[PDB]
Symmetry: C2
Subunit: 165 residues, 2 copies
């Protein structure tokens, strides 16, 4: 992102994905919701590295999850899912277990030789946590630097409080 | 087992209800990502008994009437080219291409979103319906989605 025009385009894009994850989350597609939630976290992460057949596509994807800003204590996210959940999502982002979770949230697989289906590997509690983390690391990284960002964050904030309580 | 094939048909039913739910909330780009994903999963499931399925298209049948002959040739040509993989990428991920930032809402039209979902439901109906009794229940549901989305 090189201009305030590009920052506002990226904010609109991610605002669309948040509303899409929230829409699925309420219609009880926890699995699909979680797929979008982790995809939001990636995109936010990509802004921090600084740029579908790229030769380094999985190094950019790995680094995107590594360069997420630490969430400060005593914020709305620490009240909504608690400090141990946050550390489990962060450890999963720096390991790349988030990439596995994302894969298991959309594609059936045969693992051992049992068939495993997203519907049974992603729980409501993990769908809600990842969407709230997604909102909060978007609000921390991109919101506040433009006037546009405030109208977008007013709606993003309502989703956050609906979902947190 | 037919219990594992049923679990795969229930998964694909979920994705279709999600593409539909997103399409009717005007998230065309996200819908389209899910729609292309159903076509890959249908081709992967069927073989488990780049898109290996592709439904045989019957003239003046349901899909022909809903999206037209020309759009089916374009979707089939995009599926054999590997353009559909590219359209999937562009439908979820922002990209910088020749120094300008491109977002899914500028790459994916409502027309194309509708076509790909209708095509994805017909892929499902042509490949997996009728192997198991449960398949016919699920097909009944996807047949009302198809009619609500076609008109």
């Amino acid at each position: 992102l090189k201009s305030t025009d590009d920052l506002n385009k990226c904010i609109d894009h991610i605002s669309v994905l948040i509303k899409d994850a929230y829409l699925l989350y309420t219609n009880e597609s926890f699995a699909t919701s979680t797929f979008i939630s982790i995809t939001i976290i990636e995109e936010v992460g990509k802004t921090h590295i600084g740029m579908g057949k790229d030769p380094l596509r999985n190094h950019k994807s790995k680094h995107a999850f590594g360069s997420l800003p630490t969430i400060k204590m005593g914020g709305r996210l620490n009240k909504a899912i608690g400090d141990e959940m946050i550390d489990k999502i962060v450890e999963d982002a720096e390991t790349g277990e988030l990439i596995s979770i994302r894969e298991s949230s959309l594609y059936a697989d045969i693992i051992d030789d049992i068939l495993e289906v997203p519907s049974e590997k992603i729980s409501k509690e993990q769908s809600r946590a990842l969407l709230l983390y997604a909102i909060e690391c978007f609000d921390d990284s991109l919101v506040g630097y433009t006037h546009h960002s405030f109208e977008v964050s007013e709606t993003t904030d309502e989703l956050f409080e609906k979902l947190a309580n």
